[PDB]
Amino acid sequence: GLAVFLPPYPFRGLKAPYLWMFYKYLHCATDSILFITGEDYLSVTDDEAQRARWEFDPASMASLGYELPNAQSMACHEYLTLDNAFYETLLSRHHHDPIKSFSAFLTERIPDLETELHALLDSKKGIIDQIDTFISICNCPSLEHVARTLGKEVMHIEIGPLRAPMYRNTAYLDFAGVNGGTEASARYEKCQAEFDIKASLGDLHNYFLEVLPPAETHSAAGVVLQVEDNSNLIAYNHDFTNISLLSYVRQRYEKEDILVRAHPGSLFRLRDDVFTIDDSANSLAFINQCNEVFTINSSVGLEAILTGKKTTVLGDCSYAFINELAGASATVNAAAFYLFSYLVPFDLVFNQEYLKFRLGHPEEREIVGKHIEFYSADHSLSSLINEAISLEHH
Amino acid sequence: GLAVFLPPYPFRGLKAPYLWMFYKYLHCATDSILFITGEDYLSVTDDEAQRARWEFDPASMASLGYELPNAQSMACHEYLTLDNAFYETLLSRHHHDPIKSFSAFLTERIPDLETELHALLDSKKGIIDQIDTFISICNCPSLEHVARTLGKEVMHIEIGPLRAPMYRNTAYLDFAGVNGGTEASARYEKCQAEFDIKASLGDLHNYFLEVLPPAETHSAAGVVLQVEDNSNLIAYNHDFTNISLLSYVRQRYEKEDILVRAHPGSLFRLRDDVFTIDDSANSLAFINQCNEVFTINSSVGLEAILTGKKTTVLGDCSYAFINELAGASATVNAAAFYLFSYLVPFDLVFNQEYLKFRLGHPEEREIVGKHIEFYSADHSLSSLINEAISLEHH
Ligand SMILES: Nc1ccn([C@@H]2O[C@H](COP(=O)(O)O)[C@@H](O)[C@H]2O)c(=O)n1
Ligand SMILES: Nc1ccn([C@@H]2O[C@H](COP(=O)(O)O)[C@@H](O)[C@H]2O)c(=O)n1
Ligand code: NA
Ligand code: NA
Ligand code: NA
Ligand code: NA
């Protein structure tokens, strides 16, 4: 079955950092799953000191589509637990900087981590033989090195750039890496000639919109800020930060022409003294007020591209290649492939039958057909997409 | 005379970034000064688009002790102007990141910058021969390399860690570097045996206090945040940031025991959702509520040390060596030397007669005597300091 890697290391000061994906896989589980995680994941619940975490909020559970697991739900899976001694040692090897330690976890092999993973996997039965694929919610060269030795693939899976309530929920599934080192551009290059999409970028954007767009005083430049310690601002940012992104824009625009939107999930908000601060209810209403958008690698950059805004992308990300194409035609085709073939309907990356489907490395046409079938729960590759858009049209 | 280096490069998006020091040297000038700067410094005034800058606020002028220069005041100095073409080229050589470019300016030689400096200095008269010393408000290996070739010293000068209205105004003057690569520890090591201070750390703190201390619900841990793009968070931080500093503390304390104070000058403030946020009127009232303090390299770390608080200093800074001494005795002696001999009364670093004094590299006893004479505008080195403290006592 699946071997789901959810490391317990509190790089950003939060225990069980990926608890929500632990609950989601448990909720959707149809067969037994091997969880490679930490005891923090198994004890967080019956810890009255953490009962206020957002993962326990009924609104968050309903939005992500999971329910809290019970004793029975968990008893049907196998659990391997990583110890904290390695984490303490890791911090001591990077000058006690937890963020730099996180960066090494995301971008370098850690031999001591590989040793413990091998030991855990070799600790029982034919655990290794039962493994059809690894799943990791982030890049992890330690795990990926172990996977090569054992002949297993690594699916990198995470929530996608389009999310409810504004959009249909999407997710990433990438065999090379998630956010950084992605294979979206490589997949597109191989089937680019198979795309003749009779729709505009706005039509593709409209297909994923679940709401009526906001009410269409422009700012010349909009600046998207991100969560300061998110993995793709730590590892895939090309050294840019929120503050150097702001300086970058101020080299090109006077502060009176800049509109800044802080990430609603950041610990930091902006003072009103310097820039004009955005107070929009959503990121779409914000970029609509801007003539061009600047981002490191926020999901919002995709929104700007799909709405036809001049967009600068300074960091590595899965959608950047769409922005690097000359000519409207190729850009629409690249966006269509990205949205219907690279992105996955959110629930499907937690579906074991779908994961087995992707493990066979099927053709892009079959992948698109699976996604549209799901989106359309109510022929060439372009025919599938053109007809899907057209049926949504009327 | 003096050759004052005030570069015009808007690394942080602000033109004439050190305009206030330009006005201060002009205001206190008794002789002709050579200014190596940019045209932005000379035109900012009669630019109605910048008349709201804080350097023009009468309260800021009175606090820093300068008045706006007029046509006559400036006509008695010589001006060399750096061009912007180099800045544009510099940005293109660091992936258009202005903050990374700033870092290179602070920490690396830039041959093209050295060439332009040499050309400017060689552009007229015996400009070079009239130069008694360079003054730089930041570390600049480009300028320091030029200085070596020409046989000139470089005084690194900046506002100090103790400032009005809470304290007597102080400044740095350091021949090796300011903030980073400082010589405070080296100077202390040479005369440590000459210090037998009959006062406590609180007594030294009281000497520089100009106000009555605040009214003495403790938090186990206080976190000092800094301005995100200040030079000593860009170049001398050992890679730490505000966000990794927070994670560092969260590895040791639960959020309920952490009190966070954002820098009043930062563009960012903190949300109320996670940590307990400090709303003190000053940094002293904040650290008084904490049992131990954490900082990268804020001036506030010195305050914590002088008030006897357990202090963690993660970045490079001039006062760190005080915190690395074992035993209360040596710590008080180190603090006394730092405060009376390393730190300079603010006005004196703009006084040409005092600068000439320091250019002779006098003995630590003479330096302390000059500073106490200034502080006391109303004998061994320890006798000078002990008597100064005692006279302030009664
Ligand atoms: N500056 C920002 C960044 C993100 N966001 C919201 O957060 C979601 C994910 O964004 P990141 O990839 O930037 O975390 C986006 O779809 C958008 O809904 C926002 O509203 N403003
Ligand atoms: N978190 C912080 C940082 C600085 N400060 C104020 O700013 C002045 C200089 O601090 P930095 O060296 O941190 O810029 C300090 O003396 C203190 O008065 C504050 O009040 N809170
Ligand atoms: Na991405
Ligand atoms: Na739609
Ligand atoms: Na310092
Ligand atoms: Na005093």
Residue numbers in the entry:
A (entry chain A), B (entry chain A): 1 to 216, 219 to 380, 390 to 405
Text taken from the publication that reported this structure:
WbbB, a lipopolysaccharide O-antigen synthesis enzyme from Raoultella terrigena, contains an N-terminal glycosyltransferase domain with a highly modified architecture that adds a terminal β-Kdo (3-deoxy-d-manno-oct-2-ulosonic acid) residue to the O-antigen saccharide, with retention of stereochemistry. WbbB’s two C-terminal GT domains produce a polymer with a [4)-α-Rhap-(1→3)-β-GlcpNAc-(1→] repeat unit, while the N-terminal domain of the protein contains a GT99 retaining β-Kdo transferase, referred to here as WbbBGT99. Kdo addition blocks further polymerization while creating the epitope recognized by the carbohydrate-binding module of the cognate ABC transporter, allowing export prior to ligation to lipid A-core in the periplasm. The evidence presented above strongly argues that WbbBGT99 is a retaining glycosyltransferase that uses a double-displacement mechanism analogous to that used by retaining glycoside hydrolases.
We next determined the structure of both the WbbBGT99-D232N (at 1.9 Å) and WbbBGT99-D232C (at 1.95 Å) variants as Kdo adducts. The WbbBGT99-D232N variant crystal was grown as a CMP complex, then soaked with a CMP-β-Kdo-generating reaction mix for five minutes before freezing. For both variants, clear additional density was present that could readily be modelled as an α-Kdo with an unambiguous linkage to the anomeric carbon. After refinement, in the WbbBGT99-Asn232–Kdo structure, Kdo has a 0.7 occupancy, with ADPs similar to those of surrounding side chains (suggesting around 70% conversion to the adduct), while the resulting electron density clearly defines the positions of all atoms. Significantly more adduct is apparent in the structure than was observed by LC/MS, supporting the idea that this adduct forms quickly, and then undergoes gradual hydrolysis with a half-life on an hour-time scale. The carboxylate group interacts with Arg12, as well as Ser233; in the WbbBGT99-D232N–Kdo structure, the hydrogen bond is to Ser233 N, while a ~30° rotation of the carboxylate group reorients this oxygen in the WbbBGT99-D232C–Kdo structure to instead hydrogen bond with the Ser233 Oγ. The Kdo O4 forms hydrogen bonds with Glu158 and Asn179 (as well as a structured water); O6 forms a pair of hydrogen bonds with Arg163 as well as the CMP phosphate oxygen.
